Ligand SMILES: Nc1ncnc2c1ncn2[C@@H]1O[C@H](CSCC[C@H](N)C(=O)O)[C@@H](O)[C@H]1O
């Protein structure tokens with residue numbers, strides 16, 4: 001009788017850790033959610049096949065409102081696993097679900113998996129240099145979110161990089177591309193005019209991290225805004241002050257304009 | 266003709282991903298490094314047995330100075346793997362190794378694995394709230410480094426959390442404990458007197474992330490500075506102002522004193 005929060009990784013069913021696979025294989029019941037992120041290189045079938053279990057997929061409402069009514073009950077008698085894309089507790093509210101488990105008298109364990117948060121390391125940007133992170137959310141109705149713009153500004157002022165998670169509307173199957181994120185940011189810049197995100201701003205795009213051939217592109221907004229970066233998911237990064245070796249990597253590995261080699265110190 | 270940068274994950278031999286293990290088993294040669302960090306929950310022998318391949322260990326110099334003469338030559342006509350604790354490319358200087366590969370006409374692919382950068386999410390602290398990261402280094406001779414102190418200050422000042430890596434002497438297998446890190450910071454506070462780290466500062470200690478039984482403790486320095494957090498490696502975090510949900514998780518899961526629910530929120 002226990003509950004396991006098991007991450008599935010970045011792209012496909014093989015991104016799960018060996019620890020996660022072996023424990024997942026021996027659980028009595030297996031639940032999962034696929035709304036907090038997109039695993040573009042797999043399907044539910046391949047996942048079930050790999051674990052050898054039927055996986056009951058839950059909606060955001062099932063989780064946020066009925067986790068303790070659907071999942072916890074079975075944990076009191078059996079070994080249950082709750083699967084999620086990437087790492088279970090990263091850029092989600094899943095951590096709080098452990099508190100519900102405790103209050104229900106259920107012990108929980110966390111099995112980590114590759115996360116986009118550390119995968120950004122493949123962009124060549126020093127991970128210790130990333131500042132506060134933010135999410136570019138789709139405007140809805142008359143409400144136009146802009147907080148993420150202020151985050152970039154705050155980090156940029158300190159010479160730190162900014163990781164931008166992109167919005168997702170799972171039930172509509174809508175995944176925000178880096179192109180859309182860029183369009184929204186220019187509109188915010190037009191509104192606030194803080195000189196934070198313009199046509200000349202250098203940005204980095206990472207698409208489908210975890211796959212063997214992710215798309216990694218670095219360049220000025222004016223040139224990348226209409227570029228095709230392949231299928232989702234995508235994340236956008238606005239680097240801060242670059243180190244020489246970071247610039248070198250962007251140019252050699254991400255096709256960045258050879259001119260960024262000339263870092264203003 | 267291919268070089269695979271493969272992450273080994275957080276704690277033991279099972280923290281590597283299914284993708285990483287399968288790829289490693291198919292490589293003709295397998296290298297690894299344990300100078301940036303060590304897999305405290307396993308041994309080289311256990312990792313070798315799992316991959317079913319002989320593993321040649323490389324020192325810091327072998328990598329930084331001779332990567333192209335030791336690893337890349339074999340990658341010209343064979344499939345080669347380079348194993349590192351955590352997620353590949355997280356360690357600052359590793360990204361540059363891909364440039365060396367390109368230069369040698371060698372293709373390289375990155376196989377991600379859990380990293381402490383994302384695993385700290387188990388402390389209940391929101392990932393988006395972490396700011397710049399830093400390493401607490403031991404002072405020595407006439408050298409008393411204190412930059413990590415300024416990092417905490419600049420992050421906390423903006424309501425951001427600070428992830429602190431502790432000094433490690435891989436070769437001599439000597440680890441800096443969280444207790445030691447705290448003592449150093451108190452000593453640094455006495456010199457800079459910026460009111461950044463004192464007996465009343467709330468801190469979180471994460472030990473053996475990745476194991477099924479990690480140590481997660483949150484509390485004020487005056488009460489934790491002499492507490493035993495167990496075997497290394499330890500990770501220290503100086504949280505910024507907490508979201509009530511973060512505070513609740515620390516109280517319920519990390520034994521934090523109820524006091525933080527009013528003092529640090
Ligand atoms: N493989 C991948 N490549 C690019 N972006 C990714 C990605 N996986 C997740 N993301 C990004 O992160 C968002 C989900 S946020 C949830 C993240 C997850 N817990 C983790 O640990 O990675 C997506 O909308 C997308 O913008």
Ligand code: NA
Pocket residue numbers: 127128130131382395396397398
């Ligand atoms: Na960070």
